[PDB]
Amino acid sequence: VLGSPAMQRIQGARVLVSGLQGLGAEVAKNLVLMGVGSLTLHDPHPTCWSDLAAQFLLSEQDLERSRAEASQELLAQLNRAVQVVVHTGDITEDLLLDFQVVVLTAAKLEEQLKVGTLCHKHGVCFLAADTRGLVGQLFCDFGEDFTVQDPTEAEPLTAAIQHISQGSPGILTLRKGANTHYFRDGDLVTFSGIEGMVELNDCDPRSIHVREDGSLEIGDTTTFSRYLRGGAITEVKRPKTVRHKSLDTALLQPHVVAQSSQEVHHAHCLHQAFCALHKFQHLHGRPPQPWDPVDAETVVGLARDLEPLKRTEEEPLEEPLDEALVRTVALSSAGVLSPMVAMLGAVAAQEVLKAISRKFMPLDQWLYFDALDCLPEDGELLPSPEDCALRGSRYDGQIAVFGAGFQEKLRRQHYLLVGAGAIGCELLKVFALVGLGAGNSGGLTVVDMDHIERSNLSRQFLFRSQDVGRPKAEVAAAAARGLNPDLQVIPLTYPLDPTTEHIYGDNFFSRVDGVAAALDSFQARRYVAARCTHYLKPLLEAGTSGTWGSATVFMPHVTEAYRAPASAAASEDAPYPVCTVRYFPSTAEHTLQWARHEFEELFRLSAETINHHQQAHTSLADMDEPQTLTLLKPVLGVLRVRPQNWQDCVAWALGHWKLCFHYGIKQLLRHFPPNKVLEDGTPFWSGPKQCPQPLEFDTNQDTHLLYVLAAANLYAQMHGLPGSQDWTALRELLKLLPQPDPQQMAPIFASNLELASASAEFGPEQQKELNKALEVWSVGPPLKPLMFEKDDDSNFHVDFVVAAASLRCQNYGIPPVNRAQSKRIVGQIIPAIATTTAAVAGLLGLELYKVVSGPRPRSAFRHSYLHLAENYLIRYMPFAPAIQTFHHLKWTSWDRLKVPAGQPERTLESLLAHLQEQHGLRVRILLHGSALLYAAGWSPEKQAQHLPLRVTELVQQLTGQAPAPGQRVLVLELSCEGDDEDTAFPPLHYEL
C-alpha cells in the first residue's frame, strides 16, 4: 500500500537504467509509474527496426536516433513528479557513486562485469536483466551487507486481549481467533490500547512465550498497576539481513531461486546457454543469426566447450548439458518479444523498488524465466532462416523469433478485450505492440462502462490527467491506435452483464475469435466465462491483488472451464448482519459498517423526508414518521425555525456526539443491566463478553475533534451553507468552548420536560411540533444527498465513518480499526501495483501467442501464478477437463446437447420422446432458466395439458415475451430420474 516511511525514500532515490532497449523501456516505465524521484537513462545507440517490436516509447518516426533521448520525452510525460534526465557520457565511477540502484538491461557481459564490480565496491545495488528470445535471466546484487526493514508482505498481527495477570511469567489471556495460532514464541509485540497499565503504553517492545491452550506471557507486570481491559497486542516485524556475492564470483556458482530440483537444473542449463551466447557474441562480435543452424551448432559447441570447473563442485549435474535446450535457445535468440519484456521488466522493477524502499525480500541473485513452449510443436514445422529475415517492418523483432507466417496469423485475428482498467490497458499495449489485429482483416474491441477517475488514474499509463470524466474504453482505444496506427479498435461503452445480452448477441460473438477478460469482480468473470463456454471461445483471464498475480487461459475442449469461487461471488454483494449494529458489535469491521449505514440512513434518507415525500402525498400519519424525523432533526439541533446562525459551529455537533455513544449506551443499560439478563435471571454466564460503558469526550484527543470536524463539514456541505475546514480556526473555536454541555444537559434530550419519555408519552404536542418542522423544511431549501466519493476529500466521508467506527469500537472495548480492514473494504480500494499488472499482462501475451499459434495440446498451455514480494513464480500446465458421467451418457464441462426443432416445432412430449430415444435418459424436471416446463411429479391432468403444447409457444406463454428475433438456439436445463443430487447435466440447446 501507500506507506509514508517507505515512500519518503522512494522520492529521494536516483536510478540509472542503462541499455534502453525494450526491456529497459519497460523497467523505466514501471519505475516512473511507481513514482521514483529521479531516473537517469543511458543508451546512445541509434534506434533500429528490431527495437520497435518490443518498445512502446519509440515510434517509427524516432528511427535512427539515440534510444535514451527519444524515450526521455515520453517517460517524463508519463509522470510529472518523476524527473527523467538522459545521460550522454559513458559510465564513470563517480556517476555510479552518485546513484543508488543501477540497472543494465541487455548489456554485454564485459560491461555487466565492469559495472557490477564498480557498484559492489561502493555498496551500490546492481541489477542485470536480459532477454534473448523466449528465455530471460535476472541478476540482483545488493552488496555485502543489506538489511531489509520488513521481510513479509502482511500487516502486523493485532489480537484483542481478554485478561492479563501479574506474576513472574505475567501471563495474559486473549480472545479466541486465528491470531492465536498466528502468534508464535520468540516474537516481538507492542500494545497501545489497554484499560489500565498506563505506562505500559509507549514502552519498549518485549518478547513473548507460547504456552499450551493459547497461553502467552509478557514478563514481570507485578510492579505495574491494575488492568481493567485490553484493546489489542501488535506484532513487531523482525529486521533481516541478506548478503549477496558480486557478479564476477556469482557467475561461476549461480544461486537460482526456484521451487523444485528439476527447476533448479533447468535454470542451470539456461545459465549455461546464456554464458555460451555471451561467449559467442564476444568471439565473433555478432549475435547468432535468426534460426541459423550453423550459429546454433557453434553456440552449443561453446556450451559443451565450457569447463567442468565452471559448475559447482559440491553438487554434480545429473546429466551433461542437454544439447536440445541450448540449441533451441541459440536458434530463437535473435529478436526480443513484447510479453517477455513486460514480464522481466515487471520483476526487475519490483527488485529495484525492494532495493530502494528496503521492503520485502530481495531475489537470491538469479532468476531464469523459460517460455520456450510458445514455439511451434515438434510435429509442426519450425521457422526457416529465410522467413525470419527482417523486411524493414516494425514487427521484425518478433518475426526474427516466430517467422512471417505466424505474424500474418496474428494480423488476421479478431479479439475482444472485456474491461480496460490497469490490466486492460497493459494487455491492450501488449496486443498493440505484438500486432494482434493490426490489419484490414483484423480488428479489436474494448468493453468498459466506468469513467476515468483520478485515484485509478494515478497508476495507469494509457490515461492522462486531462482525460478525467471520459469513458475508459474511448481513451484506451485512442491510446492503442496511437501505439499501433494499423490497429483498429472499436470502443464499446455498454457493459457485459446479463441485462445486456441483446446487444452482445449471437452475431457479435460469431464475429470474434477470442476473449481476454481483465475484470475487477468475480461475478463479472463468471458471467464472461459462461458466455465464452456457451460460444466456445478462447479466454484469457488475469487477476492481481497487491503484489500477487495470476494469468490463465481456458481453451475449449482442452482445459477445464473457468469456475469462480462461489463463496466470493456471493460475498461480492451481501448485506451485513443487523445484530452487531443493534447490540453487540463483535469486531471493528462491524462498527465500521454500522457507522457507514447509520450515516447513510441519517443523510441519504433525510433529504427525501425533507421535501419530496412529505410535500407530495403523505404526512406524519404514515407507518412511522416521528421516528424518521427524530433520527435526523433533533440530533442535529433543536432548530424548528430557519437557521440564521452559521452552519459551521460546535453547538449541535457535540449533541449528536453524546446521543450517538453516551446516550445510546445509557439507554441500552437502562433497557438491561450490562452484567445481567432480566429474563434469564440466572443464565449460564451473566453478561458474557459484553460490558459497554458510557464514553465521555476529550477535547485534547484527536479522534473526537476529528469526528466533530468531519460532522460539521459534512453538515455544512449537505445543508448548502459554505462550510469552512475547522482544522485552522474552528478546531480551536471548538477548543475555545470547553464546557458547552453543562448548560444544556436536560433540555436537549427531548422537548423540555421528557427526562426519559417513557413509552410514547410525547403526545400530540410533540407530534404537532414534528409536523411543523416538516412543513418548515418543505418550504425551506431542499437538502442534497451526498454519496461516498473517495476522490473528493472535501466531503469528509471516509474520515467521518472511520472516526465514528473508532469511537464506537473503543466505546465497546473493540480494538481500533486498522488500515488493513479499510483496504479489505471494497470501498477505499487501492490501485493495483504497476509491476504485478505488467507481469500478468506479459503472461497473458504469452498465452495469446500459444492460442493464435493454432491447434495445441493441453500440455502446451500454462496457467501462471506469481508473488513478487516473495519472488515466487510458477507456470504449470492446466488440468484435463473434468469428465463426469451418468449411466451410459458421458459429458464434459464444455459439450452441449443439440436437438433441432425441425420445420414444424416439436411438442414437449415429442421433445421428451426424442431425448429418451436418442440419449437414453428420462427427464423429470425441464426448466427454461427459471420457468418450469415439464415436471415428473406434476398431476397427470396437468401433464396431459402441458405435453401437446408447442415448446416455443409454451415458453412464450410462461414468460409472456416474444422470442428474440434472430435467436438461433434456446437453452434448457434438465434433470433425470435417480440422478445425483449435485450433478450438472449439459444444457439443452433447442433450435428455433
Binding site: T152, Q259, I423, S521, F522, P565, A832, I874
Partner: protein, 79 residues
C-alpha cells in the same frame, strides 16, 4: 499409515503445522487449512513444488515427504 508432519504456508508469510496421512485425500487437507485459516475452501487452492494439487487425488501421489512446505494460493479478484 503413520501420520505425517507437513506445514502449509499462509498467504501472509506465516505457516502452520498439520498432521495428515498418505492415504488422506487432498480435499481433507484443504478442509483442515480452511478451518485453521478461516477462509472458504473454494476461495483458495494449495500447491506443492510449483505444481497444483488436485482434490480427488491422494497425498501419496505428490510425494509429500515429512517436513515439506505446501504453499497456499488465493484466487485473485482485483483487475
Amino acid at each position: 499409515d503413520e501420520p505425517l508432519s507437513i506445514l502449509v504456508r499462509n498467504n501472509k508469510g506465516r505457516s502452520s503445522t498439520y498432521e495428515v496421512r498418505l492415504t488422506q485425500t487432498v480435499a481433507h487437507l484443504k478442509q483442515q487449512v480452511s478451518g485453521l485459516e478461516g477462509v472458504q475452501d473454494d476461495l483458495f487452492w494449495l500447491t506443492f513444488e510449483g505444481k497444483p494439487l488436485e482434490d480427488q487425488l491422494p497425498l501419496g501421489e505428490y510425494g509429500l515427504k515429512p517436513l515439506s512446505t505446501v504453499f497456499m494460493n488465493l484466487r485473485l479478484r482485483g483487475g
